[PDB]
Design an enzyme around this catalytic site. Sequence first.
Site, PDB file in Angstrom:
ATOM      1  N   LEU A  22       0.860  -1.205   0.000  1.00 55.38           N
ATOM      2  CA  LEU A  22       0.000   0.000   0.000  1.00 55.38           C
ATOM      3  C   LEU A  22       0.893   1.252   0.000  1.00 55.38           C
ATOM      4  O   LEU A  22       0.502   2.238  -0.638  1.00 55.38           O
ATOM      5  CB  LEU A  22      -0.938  -0.032   1.204  1.00 55.38           C
ATOM      6  N   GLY A  23       2.043   1.201   0.675  1.00 53.43           N
ATOM      7  CA  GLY A  23       2.936   2.367   0.735  1.00 53.43           C
ATOM      8  C   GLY A  23       4.218   2.057   1.473  1.00 53.43           C
ATOM      9  O   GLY A  23       4.285   0.994   2.103  1.00 53.43           O
ATOM     10  N   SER A  24       5.196   2.962   1.414  1.00 50.81           N
ATOM     11  CA  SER A  24       6.501   2.760   2.097  1.00 50.81           C
ATOM     12  C   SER A  24       7.059   4.081   2.648  1.00 50.81           C
ATOM     13  O   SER A  24       6.567   5.144   2.227  1.00 50.81           O
ATOM     14  CB  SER A  24       7.491   2.089   1.201  1.00 50.81           C
ATOM     15  N   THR A  25       7.303  -0.420   5.572  1.00 49.69           N
ATOM     16  CA  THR A  25       6.320  -0.693   4.515  1.00 49.69           C
ATOM     17  C   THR A  25       5.003  -1.091   5.142  1.00 49.69           C
ATOM     18  O   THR A  25       5.033  -1.724   6.207  1.00 49.69           O
ATOM     19  CB  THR A  25       6.868  -1.784   3.602  1.00 49.69           C
ATOM     20  N   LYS A  45       2.112  -3.764   9.066  1.00 52.85           N
ATOM     21  CA  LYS A  45       3.118  -2.717   9.127  1.00 52.85           C
ATOM     22  C   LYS A  45       4.451  -3.335   9.538  1.00 52.85           C
ATOM     23  O   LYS A  45       4.554  -3.926  10.622  1.00 52.85           O
ATOM     24  CB  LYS A  45       2.699  -1.623  10.109  1.00 52.85           C
ATOM     25  N   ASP A 128       0.155  12.855  18.384  1.00 56.20           N
ATOM     26  CA  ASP A 128       0.326  13.002  16.945  1.00 56.20           C
ATOM     27  C   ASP A 128      -1.022  13.006  16.221  1.00 56.20           C
ATOM     28  O   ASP A 128      -1.126  12.498  15.098  1.00 56.20           O
ATOM     29  CB  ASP A 128       1.240  11.901  16.377  1.00 56.20           C
TER      30      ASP A 128
HETATM   31  C1  LIG Z   1      -5.783   1.017   2.199  1.00 59.17           C
HETATM   32  O1  LIG Z   1      -4.985   1.946   2.745  1.00 59.17           O
HETATM   33  C2  LIG Z   1      -4.555   1.730   4.106  1.00 59.17           C
HETATM   34  C3  LIG Z   1      -5.287   1.000   5.081  1.00 59.17           C
HETATM   35  C4  LIG Z   1      -4.743   0.849   6.454  1.00 59.17           C
HETATM   36  N1  LIG Z   1      -5.449   0.142   7.397  1.00 59.17           N
HETATM   37  C5  LIG Z   1      -4.959   0.020   8.615  1.00 59.17           C
HETATM   38  N2  LIG Z   1      -3.794   0.567   8.943  1.00 59.17           N
HETATM   39  C6  LIG Z   1      -3.106   1.228   8.106  1.00 59.17           C
HETATM   40  N3  LIG Z   1      -1.805   1.792   8.576  1.00 59.17           N
HETATM   41  C7  LIG Z   1      -1.357   1.434   9.867  1.00 59.17           C
HETATM   42  C8  LIG Z   1      -1.124   2.420  10.761  1.00 59.17           C
HETATM   43  C9  LIG Z   1      -0.658   2.096  12.122  1.00 59.17           C
HETATM   44  C10 LIG Z   1      -0.469   0.806  12.479  1.00 59.17           C
HETATM   45  C11 LIG Z   1      -0.700  -0.170  11.603  1.00 59.17           C
HETATM   46 CL1  LIG Z   1      -0.466  -1.857  12.044  1.00 59.17          CL
HETATM   47  C12 LIG Z   1      -1.163   0.152  10.228  1.00 59.17           C
HETATM   48  F1  LIG Z   1      -1.401  -0.924   9.321  1.00 59.17           F
HETATM   49  C13 LIG Z   1      -3.592   1.387   6.781  1.00 59.17           C
HETATM   50  C14 LIG Z   1      -2.836   2.137   5.783  1.00 59.17           C
HETATM   51  C15 LIG Z   1      -3.375   2.286   4.473  1.00 59.17           C
HETATM   52  O2  LIG Z   1      -2.665   2.960   3.538  1.00 59.17           O
HETATM   53  C16 LIG Z   1      -2.668   4.336   3.472  1.00 59.17           C
HETATM   54  O3  LIG Z   1      -3.410   5.063   4.041  1.00 59.17           O
HETATM   55  N4  LIG Z   1      -1.687   4.682   2.590  1.00 59.17           N
HETATM   56  C17 LIG Z   1      -2.074   5.631   1.619  1.00 59.17           C
HETATM   57  C18 LIG Z   1      -1.101   5.713   0.431  1.00 59.17           C
HETATM   58  N5  LIG Z   1       0.130   6.184   0.797  1.00 59.17           N
HETATM   59  C19 LIG Z   1       1.026   5.695   0.004  1.00 59.17           C
HETATM   60  C20 LIG Z   1       0.462   5.953   2.072  1.00 59.17           C
HETATM   61  C21 LIG Z   1      -0.220   4.741   2.744  1.00 59.17           C
HETATM   62  C22 LIG Z   1       0.211   4.880   4.193  1.00 59.17           C
END
Ligand SMILES: COc1cc2ncnc(Nc3cccc(Cl)c3F)c2cc1OC(=O)N1CCN(C)C[C@H]1C
Length: 273
Positions: A22-25, A45, A128
């Site tokens: 989804l993004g960077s991971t 993550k 944050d």
């Molecule tokens: C489908 O999109 C996402 C869904 C997410 N569901 C849960 N948590 C998420 N993050 C997360 C945060 C904290 C702890 C843990 Cl364990 C996590 F997994 C999710 C992140 C997602 O991706 C974005 O928002 N993107 C958007 C496009 N960019 C490139 C950046 C990238 C970051």
Amino acid sequence: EAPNQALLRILKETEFKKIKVLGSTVYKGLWIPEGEKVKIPVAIKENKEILDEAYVMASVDNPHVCRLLGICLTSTVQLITQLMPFGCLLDYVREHKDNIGSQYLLNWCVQIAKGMNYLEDRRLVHRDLAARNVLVKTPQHVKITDFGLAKLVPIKWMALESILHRIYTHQSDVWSYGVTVWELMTFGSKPYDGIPASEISSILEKGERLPQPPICTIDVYMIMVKCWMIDADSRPKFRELIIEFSKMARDPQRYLVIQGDDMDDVVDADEYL
Ligand SMILES: COc1cc2ncnc(Nc3cccc(Cl)c3F)c2cc1OC(=O)N1CCN(C)C[C@H]1C
């Protein structure tokens, strides 16, 4: 003072499939608990810091906060959580800036305040809060995430007393709430755009604040301004923000002025208890 009896679940790597980036991971995927007949859409993550984050995320449980499903300890430390399919609310407001109505904006304000009130109940300071750290499960349902900074640096979201004296409280979070609301009401503008972070504390000390968004009645902007009072105890409480934004959500057009106002066994984490 009360013991933290949250459960930390260690998940076998063999229970995770369809991993895509989804993004960077951070990746999306499917979690199939062994011997459970359920498929759970997840984000993953990819050390003391990630585990401090895992500690707080495993210790929260509220409809408006993202909880940790478990960790996987193979090559890397991976945090597994409910997939929030629409991504972060900052990117969402920017892309759908022409299909976002008053009801949605005010409802999101109520929900973020509920999440933050719950954190206060748990004696957690987020430190944050920002639109980049609120996720979208559906356009009707958002949740606060990113606790890698929470405790029992983003200058443009911080209370003046945090910038000057590294003082952080629930009322410092209220300041960041105010900034997050400004991001939503401007459909994702950058706060203090073009102003270097080093000059921020100086501007705030002179009395300058973020300006009234075009769609905001004075009712809504005055709430935002109250979150930016110098006296931390003069700012609203989250439980008061829930109340005020709920009232406004019952008549949204009075308060915002917007022109134009793998499938058989899938279970959402919110129904997997
Ligand atoms: C489908 O999109 C996402 C869904 C997410 N569901 C849960 N948590 C998420 N993050 C997360 C945060 C904290 C702890 C843990 Cl364990 C996590 F997994 C999710 C992140 C997602 O991706 C974005 O928002 N993107 C958007 C496009 N960019 C490139 C950046 C990238 C970051």
